[PDB]
Design a binder for this molecule. Sequence first.
Ligand code: HEM
Ligand code: HEM
Ligand code: HEM
Ligand code: HEM
Lengths: 146, 146, 146, 146
Amino acid sequence: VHLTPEEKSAVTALWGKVNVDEVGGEALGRLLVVYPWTQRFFESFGDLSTPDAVMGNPKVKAHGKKVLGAFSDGLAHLDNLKGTFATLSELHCDKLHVDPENFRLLGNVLVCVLAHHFGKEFTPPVQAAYQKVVAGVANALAHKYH
Amino acid sequence: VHLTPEEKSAVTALWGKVNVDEVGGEALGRLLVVYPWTQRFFESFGDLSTPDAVMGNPKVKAHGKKVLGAFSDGLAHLDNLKGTFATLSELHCDKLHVDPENFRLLGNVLVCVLAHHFGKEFTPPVQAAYQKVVAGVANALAHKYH
Amino acid sequence: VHLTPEEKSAVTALWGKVNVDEVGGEALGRLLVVYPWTQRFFESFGDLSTPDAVMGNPKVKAHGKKVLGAFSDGLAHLDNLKGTFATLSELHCDKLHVDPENFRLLGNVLVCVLAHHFGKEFTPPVQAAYQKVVAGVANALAHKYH
Amino acid sequence: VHLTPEEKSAVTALWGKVNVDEVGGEALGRLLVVYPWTQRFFESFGDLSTPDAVMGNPKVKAHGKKVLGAFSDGLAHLDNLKGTFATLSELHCDKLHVDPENFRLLGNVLVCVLAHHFGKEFTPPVQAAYQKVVAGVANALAHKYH
Ligand code: HEM
Ligand code: HEM
Ligand code: HEM
Ligand code: HEM
């Protein structure tokens, strides 16, 4: 990732309004609903049979806050994502076997959640800057596969 | 596309509140801003060199309006997308040579614009439904390549 | 898939020189080795910790044969793949949750295997004909998702 | 990109046995033939209308050697593809506007040509290693986009 001071400032500014506790659960639950093959990594979380089953699932919600916490930390360390995600990359690639494409899907779901939450404040250059970050994060997490 | 009537209905209902015109200009503009290589197809439209340049371009607005109108048409003819887009596919594949991936990015930008616009009424199952449609359209447009 | 009769014939003739035994197993094994996340689907098959383990795995070799088997049968119905594969589609989408992307990676390995196997006979237009087919098979298998 | 001691040596050895004239013209022609939309970047080259047109075209064979030429450096600097490819990245992203997906397609064609060009020395581990290289090169050329 290479953001201009203006992109970075825009990015960190909007992120500060984010209720991660909330956005985390919405992003992960929407991933499971929209791209249903992703449910396979979470088959032990219980009932993932209906959109309601997914969205209010306590394990889904709890996990999404975790994922989002890691994301916030990538945002503060844009200069060393590879470093920052070093151990998470070994976990996902080596142990979990998460397809790199799935990281791209969650990135896109997150963008859509931000749009949904911020409406108007989520401008084209803000979306463009967010796309660069999510691609950057996806890249750092699939690191162990490169 | 496989839409449950519950899905067909939720889709239909919401498209009914869309401002095609506007959403069209928004979605097209955001594509060019977010996925800058797509500007190559619209070099003849004027200045696209700044996000402000892009969003301001009346050729971009007009065109996105044309794009969405075709979209509205695929929505009404969900069981005949290949036939409905017959003519558009030849144009895009044979003359313009639009990469199939680009149809997919536009579908993505369009889902984000509807989120951005509908906020709260843009629920997971609606998102899931729109996601199926957008994929169906992209597939129908790239058909000449298949 | 729209193949010219010249394309259909080139497809048919090369296929007729293929040992599905040897190819199915080689392709399935190369998949697991080159795109390691795919192994997640085959944990019940035994050890896949090494390439050698992968390529040597009899359930792999044997699963491969079955996969090419099915393939060979869409070939006879390039006319209707969605219908040929309709039932394997429910299985993979509904029961197995195989990412659409995985189908495309297998299509890629299959193509590389043919190239590797029929060097100079695998000409540009023959390649072009096989890409349309593997892409057609992948879309047919991912259809329940659409 | 990270290669095993072994993977590295196996990569470098096979490369010094490569006829870049041949591989370069074949990789580039195959790309144009297999994914026809790519023909839009080479409008300047003349007749690309047919596989024979394409494969016959010396502007094609000539650029293919240039492309592969650059690919060769990359290889001597696997530790810094990002740095090695920095200025080509600026040309491709800022000037030519080549979609990042196109770099991936060329990468794939390229691995197909190597398989075709070495049959049997192109083992599963060799493939895996070239796949990691090709992927790293594609990412290093799309670098100016993120
Ligand atoms: C933005 C990208 C992502 C980030 C930052 C992220 C972050 C995390 C974190 C912080 C953990 C917990 C590690 C621990 O156990 O402390 C985790 C675990 C996990 N993640 Fe990821 N994740 C991402 C994307 C994904 C995707 C796309 C999937 C699959 C579709 C996935 C599947 C999992 C699973 C299955 C676990 C382990 C769950 C468990 O321990 O029961 N993650 N992730
Ligand atoms: C996926 C949904 C899309 C729809 C429904 C759509 C629809 C249309 C329509 C209705 C036209 C006007 C036809 C005419 O010339 O009479 C058109 C033209 C065009 N479209 Fe598409 N389009 C889509 C995607 C794309 C994408 C993703 C791109 C490129 C990045 C693209 C590039 C163009 C160009 C360059 C033109 C012609 C402009 C000119 O007049 O020079 N389209 N499209
Ligand atoms: C695109 C070409 C493919 C074809 C034609 C195909 C076809 C088949 C067939 C014929 C079976 C046996 C079904 C039965 O027992 O009735 C099967 C099972 C299976 N396939 Fe697919 N397949 C393809 C790709 C894939 C991919 C890419 C993956 C995963 C990476 C995959 C994962 C599986 C699994 C996990 C099973 C069940 C194996 C078991 O019994 O443990 N397949 N497939
Ligand atoms: C392996 C990935 C690639 C490498 C290493 C590469 C390398 C190069 C090099 C070395 C040049 C010549 C620069 C100069 O002397 O000015 C060039 C130019 C060019 N490349 Fe790339 N390239 C790659 C992929 C692609 C792809 C996939 C496309 C499009 C589909 C593309 C389109 C072009 C075009 C249009 C030019 C300008 C040729 C002209 O003078 O008309 N390249 N590339």
